[PDB]
Amino acid sequence: ADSDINIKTGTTDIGSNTTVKTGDLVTYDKENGMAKKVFYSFIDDKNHNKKLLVIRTKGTIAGQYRVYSEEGANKSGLAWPSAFKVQLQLPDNEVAQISDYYPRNSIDTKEYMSTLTYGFNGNVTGDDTGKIGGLIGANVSIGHTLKYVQPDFKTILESPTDKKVGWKVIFNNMVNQNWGPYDRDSWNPVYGNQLFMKTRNGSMKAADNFLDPNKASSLLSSGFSPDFATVITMDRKASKQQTNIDVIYERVRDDYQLHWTSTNWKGTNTKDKWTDRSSERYKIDWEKEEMTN
Amino acid sequence: ADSDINIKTGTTDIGSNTTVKTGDLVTYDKENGMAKKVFYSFIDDKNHNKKLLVIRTKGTIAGQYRVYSEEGANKSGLAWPSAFKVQLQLPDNEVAQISDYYPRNSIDTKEYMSTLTYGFNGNVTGDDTGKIGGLIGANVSIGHTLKYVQPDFKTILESPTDKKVGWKVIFNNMVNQNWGPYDRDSWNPVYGNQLFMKTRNGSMKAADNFLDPNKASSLLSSGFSPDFATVITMDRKASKQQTNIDVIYERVRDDYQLHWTSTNWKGTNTKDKWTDRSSERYKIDWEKEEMTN
Amino acid sequence: ADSDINIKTGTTDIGSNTTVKTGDLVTYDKENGMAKKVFYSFIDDKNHNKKLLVIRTKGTIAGQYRVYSEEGANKSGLAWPSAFKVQLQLPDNEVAQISDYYPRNSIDTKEYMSTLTYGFNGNVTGDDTGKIGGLIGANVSIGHTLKYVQPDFKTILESPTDKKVGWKVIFNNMVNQNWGPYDRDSWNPVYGNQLFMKTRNGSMKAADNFLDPNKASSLLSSGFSPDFATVITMDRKASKQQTNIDVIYERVRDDYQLHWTSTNWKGTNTKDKWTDRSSERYKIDWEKEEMTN
Amino acid sequence: ADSDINIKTGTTDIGSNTTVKTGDLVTYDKENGMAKKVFYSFIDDKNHNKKLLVIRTKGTIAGQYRVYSEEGANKSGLAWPSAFKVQLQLPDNEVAQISDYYPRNSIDTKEYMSTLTYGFNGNVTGDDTGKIGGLIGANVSIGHTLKYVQPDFKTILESPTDKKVGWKVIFNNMVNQNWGPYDRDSWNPVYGNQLFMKTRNGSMKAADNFLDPNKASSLLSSGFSPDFATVITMDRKASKQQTNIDVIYERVRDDYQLHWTSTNWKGTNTKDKWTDRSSERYKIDWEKEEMTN
Amino acid sequence: ADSDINIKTGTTDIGSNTTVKTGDLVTYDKENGMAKKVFYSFIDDKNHNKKLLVIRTKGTIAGQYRVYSEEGANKSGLAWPSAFKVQLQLPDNEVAQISDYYPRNSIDTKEYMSTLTYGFNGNVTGDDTGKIGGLIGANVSIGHTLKYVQPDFKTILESPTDKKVGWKVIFNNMVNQNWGPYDRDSWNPVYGNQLFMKTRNGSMKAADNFLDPNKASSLLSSGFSPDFATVITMDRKASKQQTNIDVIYERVRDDYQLHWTSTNWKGTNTKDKWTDRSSERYKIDWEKEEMTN
Amino acid sequence: ADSDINIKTGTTDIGSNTTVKTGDLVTYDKENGMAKKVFYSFIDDKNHNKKLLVIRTKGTIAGQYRVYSEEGANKSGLAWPSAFKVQLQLPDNEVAQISDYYPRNSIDTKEYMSTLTYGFNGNVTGDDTGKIGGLIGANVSIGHTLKYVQPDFKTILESPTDKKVGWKVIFNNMVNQNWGPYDRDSWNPVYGNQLFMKTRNGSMKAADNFLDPNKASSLLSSGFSPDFATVITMDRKASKQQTNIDVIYERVRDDYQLHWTSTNWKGTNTKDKWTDRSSERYKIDWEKEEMTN
């Protein structure tokens, strides 16, 4: 930061002595259950070598945790969102470029703990029969503990270019009624993958044996609200001062299935079975400082 | 945030050099025990592509933890609020759109901890009878701990469109005199669902065997105070500059019942037995910047 | 908050470009041991659709932890405050309305923790008699911990209307010289309710066997200092621009009794035995922007 | 706070557009070891219904941890401060009132923790004599822990009126060389009250057997520095515009005694043996805005 | 900081009363999978003895976690990024100098904990055969725990000169499905280096036995986003007012191999097998305050 | 604070609309190893009833951890600083007074924790001889833990008057290579006081058997940097407008001695063996607003 290098805070920032033009474009995609919002800002600071557009992609991609199959009362399936994604792309031949984006991938950490105990102990026994007994003992104990935080979903920056950027918010793992965490690959030899299994051997129909949505990450039903920022830079001298950009919002759904064996419930998870893509083109007008869809 | 992408803090925000018009509209619905308050703000920032209205839905929905039935001294029932909801909806044909809303669903987390211990230990025994004994031993120990926060109620953003948004504040689980937590589905083979059971086998009448409201989440009696924000955007060019909007406040009540067996008290819980809906239409005047009810 | 929805912090707030008129009214009620203070502010912001009055109810309600009866040296009683309350009410026919209030009821939470440990261990025994012995062992361990905060008193918002609001600060539970917590319903078959019992079988007179007030919540003796805010809104167009409001401060006292059995001390607690209500009417003048009592 | 009720921070506060007159009055009371300082501020804000005086009582009451008696080398006593107090009082006849005071008594809390562990374990024994043995075992464990903070001294607001306010800072409990805590009533059948006892059976003279003051709360020797605020309000219309006010600073000392039995040291504590009171009258001039002593 | 040495905060900082010229240069290196962004700022403060340029090197170096070989179904290899690097260098003969850089190397810490427990215990035994027994025992236990945080990657400032500076972000260690941490040198006699091994003896092909990328540091796939600052100072008096500077972004990849023994999977890691270097020259114009590439 | 009593933050403070005159006086006392710095500020605010001088006493008193005696190779001594002190005193007859000082003595606290565990357990034994055995058991456990912070040195305000104030920074206790803490009175029957003893029975000369200063609090060698504030108030009316003030900096050294017994090293500590006092008189000129030495 500025102060670490002896510079008054906010001296190197863009956007003082400049009117900034902003706007909202909201599109609801009924077919894909995605409320899409772009909030943009043009910043033409004459002390900066280029024009800037900051595009904030917001809105909410519905989870759409749908209990689908019902082929008997022994078999049931749940489509669930294992990934949410937002991507932006400038066409191949445009002069505008992707200059920055937030957030980015941060370095994860963990606490490591080692312990060492030495112990000495003694005994003196004795009955009324006048018999005395004794014990001298020692022990060593070496321990290690590893402690880290595990978010239900991880938010990842996909490797940008100067023409494309995106994020994926991927299912990581989750607690199911105090057991777990379970994840997409959990495997118990008897119960299979218990990720969304309500009971090991309850006697309801299959379709009633999924974890109550209220007891699961609320991103799985009500859905995820992106909050991502992209900065696009544009040369003042360029011939063409109109740029197109494509924004895709994406839901990736896995397929969690329950079946009754003879004795108990067993779950399966299949990765990436369905993908919903909602694609929109936006027109960036650098002269008027407007985005339209 | 602005500074992550080299931009002076608050450059891209809306609402400088603008008079903002605000107001309060308060309606008490006596029949449903809901104090409803809208606090609104019109922000017409000429550097923004659209007019904005921020609607804050506040007030307090009473819990209404009512001990109802009394059919003998063996049977009693308690109506209790398992969910509170606030929803806003712009009619089908309006040009105004829902642009934003706060709060949203955030990613839940958990702490995971694993431990490994190795142990060596030794003995020398001995009595007065001159008899010497000895012991050499080892042990391994693998451990895991999972730690996470469990609020009494969860606050959840329901999947928005460009025409509707709502929140539901749903009962999650709760401690009953240091036991539990219990939830809507708790089931002990003998005591049933102990969620609101004061005693396992006290000899009061049924109606006196419910947990003291003061010892339960105060949302259950005194009630919940919504504090939600919705942003509505409107085109300056639209022909009709008057918008209608509906706000519903909602209480969902479960039915917790106690009955005496021969030996002890048993509780049952039935989901979503009663719903109270309080609906209000508001008129948004974009030219005069007033909301009325 | 403003920034979450792309709005410059404090844009939607009331009370810029406005002189605010404030005042203090202090009344001491000698009979009921209540110092009552109203601090008010009229905020007439012309960009807001209504006039506002913010009424802050402060002061201090003395605890009045009185050791009362002394009928012998075997029997004694303690009056103690189990609840403090502040309530405001606008008369039935007034046009002013209660628009807001702080604080409100917060969602309580709790930390849940589960542990699982597996263990293997081995032995080699041996005496001087040349005899060798052996042991192989295993173990499982499943654990859970629940952790939550328990304040001595809870502060609760009573379900408001548009005409009334109040808070009650109620006794929750308390530690007695490192035992407990105890509460209003604690019951040990031998000692009864030990809430304020200094000793199980000391030989002082009963009146000397109550916990030292310095070792209890200081709300019990020195008392409670309310700090509550109520916002009243009024129409600029109303005919009547004078409004009455009533404020009650209230102390509810329980009755904790000690008696000697043949062997030990036993305590009893009786709920809500005495109530002290101090009522004041205030006159709100919206034209002059004054409150008087 | 302002923002909780949609109001720009600091709108409702007193004291903009006002010259504030302040002053210091310092008095040292040599007999009682009390440095007394009043820092005052008159705020006449014309938008407030009354004139205000903020009186801050500061300075330092010396502890005066004196090892006093020495009647032999078997008997010794220690005078030590168990309480410090500051009180302000407006005479009977005054029209000025005490309007506020800080700090106040806040609600104490505690963390409660419950634990439940189930355990299974197995064995297989065996010697060279071909003899096989076996063990199957189970265990349950229910736990509770209570966790709270215990300051060495508690700071308590004494129940104010409109004419008097005071604080007492009272000894709560203390650690003695890692043992305890002990308090004023600690009682071990053999050692008595060990609060300030250096050793159980050292062979120094009694006067050398007290805890080193540097190893005790520093309030006990170097003393306590009050930092309390009182607000006095006065009517602009009042006839007499001069107000008297009395301030007492108080030290209460207990008497901790050591005596040798035949075998060990035994300690006694006697409550409230000596009280030092330093009283000062201050003249408040509301027309000139000065306080004098 | 300023205030620690009695100086008004921000008095000693550079860059008030000065127009600052900034710019963005973005270059995507397709061959090396590196998005490179330079954000620069020239600050010519006339109260400072030299001109300054702050160069912020950002963008993203893709991880490029490629599962490469497939020579049978017994042998597979993974190229993975063990280091990312950014370096700046001024040519030999330039008068400009590297003056500062952020971040720098921090002192790491660790918590140390020692424990001592003494234990006494006693028994009285007895059967129906009238026989009485007894046990007296003691134990000592001396313990230590060491606790520290271990990031997945460390960020290190390479020893600067006045002509060069760089950072390397190097793989440190990582958790593999709750085991580990493992690092580049982990060696288990049977399993080899388990760093990226999914299973010890699953029966898939080798290429399917690598840890799921979503379960590993996201720096390994999606990649690292540098965020580094360099300050270059230049003399006003210098004859040549143009400076060249080279910036290298670098990916170092290790080679993790899996092979089947007869019984289980074994992993190997070879350090620094592939290096990708992307080099760019930039032209600094001190008179016009522009950087170009 | 201001806001607790409804007053705009910083309204009651001294020192707006006032030129403040400040200065530094530095004196190094070579003989006593004390760098003494006074930083002062005169604040003559006409809205305050008196003139103020703030005197900040800074600099550094060197530790002077000197291994002194060497009378053989069996006996050695270490002079070490057990206290550092700064005091200010206005002569008897001066009209100026000490009005305030920072820091002051704060109330210490501690965390207290109690635990109660109940346990039930069972067994089934058995040999090949067909013989079955059994065990039923219970256990109780009552626990307490006490947790508090112990700084190496305590910083204490000595009881001020209106004419004198000082601080002492006194040695409290310390860890010696992970053992201890030890303090001035530690006493082990065999090793004596181990405070600064490097080894129990190493065979170096005594002078080489002291703890490495780098492994001890750095106040013990490199020394202590006072940072204390005193406020002096003066009447505008006074005849004499010149005030003298004395500032003493002080080092108190204990004497830790090691001697070899026949078998091991034994340490002694003697309190307060050497005192170094560095005294300076300063002249305060209230008319010119200067301090000189």
3-state secondary structure B153-213: EEEEEECCCCCEEEEEEEECCEEECCEEEECCCCCECCCECCCCECCCCCCCCHHHCECCH
CB atoms within 10 A of CB C100: 27
Give the CA distances from residue F101 to residues C234, D37, F97, in Å, rounded to whole numbers and listed in that order: 50, 11, 12
Distance CA F137, CA B207 (A): 39
CB contacts, 8 Å: E114 with chain F = 178
E strands along D45-131, which residues? 51-61, 66-70, 75-89, 97-102, 111-127
Peptide bond into B181 cis (omega under 30): yes
Smallest Cα distance from D259 to chain C, Å: 25
Do chain C and chain D touch with ≥3 beta carbon pairs under 8 Å? yes
Please name which of A12, C17, F48, B72 lies closest in space to residue E102, comparing C-alpha atoms. A12
Q: How many CB pairs under 8 A join D and F?
A: 202
Q: Which of F5, F6, F117, F123 to mutate to test the interface with C (most CBs of C within 10 A)?
A: F6
Residue D179 phi, psi dihedral angles, 5° rounding: -105, 160
CB contacts, 8 Å: D148 with chain C = 175
Which structure tokens are listed for D26? 């310092």
Enter the DSSP assignment of E107: P
Q: How many helices (H) and strands (E) does chain A have?
A: 0, 16
Do chain A and chain B touch with ≥3 beta carbon pairs under 8 Å? yes
A198: Cα within 13 Å, side-chain hemisphere? 18
3-state secondary structure of D127: strand
Per DSSP bridges, beta strands A153-158 and A164-171 are: antiparallel
CB contacts, 8 Å: E23 with chain A = 48-50
CB contacts, 8 Å: D63 with chain F = 159
Please name which of A133, A129, A126 lies closest in space to residue E133, comparing C-alpha atoms. A126
Chain D nearest-CA residue for B24: D6
Give the max Cα distance, chain E: 110
Across the interface, of E39, E56, E178, the residue whose CB is closest to B114 is E178
Please name which of D28, D65, D58 lies closest in space to residue D251, comparing C-alpha atoms. D65
Q: In what order do the strands lie in the sheet with B132-149?
A: E111-126, E132-149, A111-127, A132-151, B109-127, B132-149, C111-127, C132-149, D111-127, D132-149, F111-127, F132-147
Tokens 């008079």 locate to B19
Distance CA C161, CA B30 (A): 8
Give the CA distances from residue B12 to residues A23, A43, B100, in Å, rounded to whole numbers and listed in that order: 10, 8, 16
Please answer yes or no on whether A5 and E181 come within 8 Å at the CB atom. no
CB contacts, 8 Å: B223 with chain C = 105, 159
Do chain D and chain A touch with ≥3 beta carbon pairs under 8 Å? no
CB contacts, 8 Å: E178 with chain B = 112, 114, 144
CB contacts, 8 Å: E6 with chain F = 22, 39, 56
Give the CA distances from residue A130 to residues A126, A135, B129, in Å, rounded to whole numbers and listed in that order: 7, 17, 11
Give the determination technique: X-ray
Across the interface, of E6, E114, E144, the residue whose CB is closest to F39 is E6
Please name which of C16, C54, F2, C18 lies closest in space to residue D8, comparing C-alpha atoms. C16
* Cα end-to-end distance, chain D, whole Å: 37
Smallest Cα distance from F176 to chain D, Å: 18
* Cα end-to-end distance, chain B, whole Å: 37
Smallest Cα distance from F124 to chain C, Å: 14
Domains of chain B in start order, with CATH, are 1-293 (2.70.240.10)
Which structure tokens are listed for F174? 């310390």
Distance CA D41, CA D54 (A): 5
| Cβ proximity of D191 and D197 under 8 Å | yes
> Letter for the amino acid at E235?
D
Distance CA B127, CA C184 (A): 57
Distance CA B8, CA A9 (A): 10
Instruction: Annotate A238-264 with b (16+ C-beta within 10 A) or e (fewer).
Output: eeebebebebebbbbbbbbbbbbeeee
Looking at chain A, which subunits does it touch, using at least 3 CB pairs closer than 8 Å as the criterion? Answer: B, C, E
Resolution (A): 2.5
Smallest Cα distance from A177 to chain C, Å: 11
CB contacts, 8 Å: F118 with chain D = 141-143
Please name which of F70, F67, F94, F71 lies closest in space to residue F80, comparing C-alpha atoms. F67
| Cβ proximity of F6 and D14 under 8 Å | yes
Enter the DSSP assignment of A194: -
Q: Which of F41, F56, F178, F215 to mutate to test the interface with E (most CBs of E within 10 A)?
A: F178
Do chain B and chain F touch with ≥3 beta carbon pairs under 8 Å? no
Instruction: Annotate B252-289 with b (16+ C-beta within 10 A) or e (fewer).
Output: bbbbbbbbbeeeebbbebeeeeeebebebebebebeeb
Q: Which of A8, A145, A228, A269 to mutate to test the interface with E (most CBs of E within 10 A)?
A: A8
Enter the DSSP assignment of E203: -
B86: Cα within 13 Å, side-chain hemisphere? 27
Chain B nearest-CA residue for D116: B179
| Cβ proximity of A87 and A248 under 8 Å | yes
CB atoms within 10 A of CB B4: 13
Please answer yes or no on whether D104 and C225 come within 8 Å at the CB atom. yes
Distance CA F48, CA D59 (A): 19
Do chain E and chain B touch with ≥3 beta carbon pairs under 8 Å? yes
Smallest Cα distance from D141 to chain B, Å: 14
Distance CA E142, CA D258 (A): 36
Smallest Cα distance from A7 to chain C, Å: 26
Please answer yes or no on whether B178 and D6 come within 8 Å at the CB atom. no
Which structure tokens are listed for C248? 């009650």
Peptide bond into C103 cis (omega under 30): yes
Residue B208 phi, psi dihedral angles, 5° rounding: -105, 5
Smallest Cα distance from B162 to chain D, Å: 26
Please answer yes or no on whether C56 and F112 come within 8 Å at the CB atom. no
Q: Which of B5, B6, B146 to mutate to test the interface with E (most CBs of E within 10 A)?
A: B6
| Cβ proximity of E147 and E110 under 8 Å | yes
Looking at chain C, which subunits does it touch, using at least 3 CB pairs closer than 8 Å as the criterion? Answer: A, B, D, F
> Letter for the amino acid at A239?
S
CB contacts, 8 Å: C233 with chain D = none
Distance CA D208, CA D76 (A): 9
Question: What's CA B146's distance to the chain center, in Å?
Answer: 23
Residue C71 phi, psi dihedral angles, 5° rounding: -100, 75
A284: Cα within 13 Å, side-chain hemisphere? 31
- Host H or E run for residue F115: strand F111-127
Distance CA D139, CA F122 (A): 7
Please name which of A225, A39, A275, A169 lies closest in space to residue B160, comparing C-alpha atoms. A225
Residues 6+ apart with CB under 8 A from F116: D143, D144, D145, F140, F141, F142, F143
CB atoms within 10 A of CB F88: 23
CA angle A210, A211, A215 (to 5 degrees): 160
Per DSSP bridges, beta strands A51-61 and A228-234 are: antiparallel
Looking at chain B, which subunits does it touch, using at least 3 CB pairs closer than 8 Å as the criterion? Answer: A, C, D, E
| Cβ proximity of B121 and A150 under 8 Å | no
CB atoms within 10 A of CB C66: 12
Residues 6+ apart with CB under 8 A from B115: A143, A144, A145, A146, B141, B142, B143, B144, B145, C117
Peptide bond into E103 cis (omega under 30): yes
Give the CA distances from residue C273 to residues B254, C254, E25, E261, in Å, rounded to whole numbers and listed in that order: 34, 5, 78, 82
Distance CA D22, CA D43 (A): 9
Tokens 């720098």 locate to E104
Distance CA E9, CA E1 (A): 8
E strands along C103-131, which residues? 111-127
3-state secondary structure of D198: coil
D236: Cα within 13 Å, side-chain hemisphere? 11
Chain B nearest-CA residue for E23: B6
CB contacts, 8 Å: B38 with chain C = none
Smallest Cα distance from D113 to chain B, Å: 9
Which structure tokens are listed for D268? 């006694």
| Cβ proximity of D180 and D99 under 8 Å | no
CB contacts, 8 Å: E169 with chain A = 107
| Cβ proximity of C96 and C234 under 8 Å | yes
Q: Which of E123, E199, E214, E221 to mutate to test the interface with A (most CBs of A within 10 A)?
A: E214
Across the interface, of F7, F118, F122, the residue whose CB is closest to D14 is F7
Q: Which of A17, A26, A101 to mutate to test the interface with B (most CBs of B within 10 A)?
A: A26
Give the CA distances from residue B257 to residues B152, B253, B271, B273, C169, in Å, rounded to whole numbers and listed in that order: 21, 13, 12, 12, 30
Give the CA distances from residue B26 to residues B250, B290, C100, D247, D270, in Å, rounded to whole numbers and listed in that order: 16, 14, 9, 48, 61
Please name which of B49, B74, B110 lies closest in space to residue B233, comparing C-alpha atoms. B49
Alpha-carbon Rg of chain E, whole angstroms? 29
| Cβ proximity of F200 and F191 under 8 Å | yes
3-state secondary structure of B3: helix
Chain E nearest-CA residue for F38: E6
| Cβ proximity of B2 and C9 under 8 Å | no
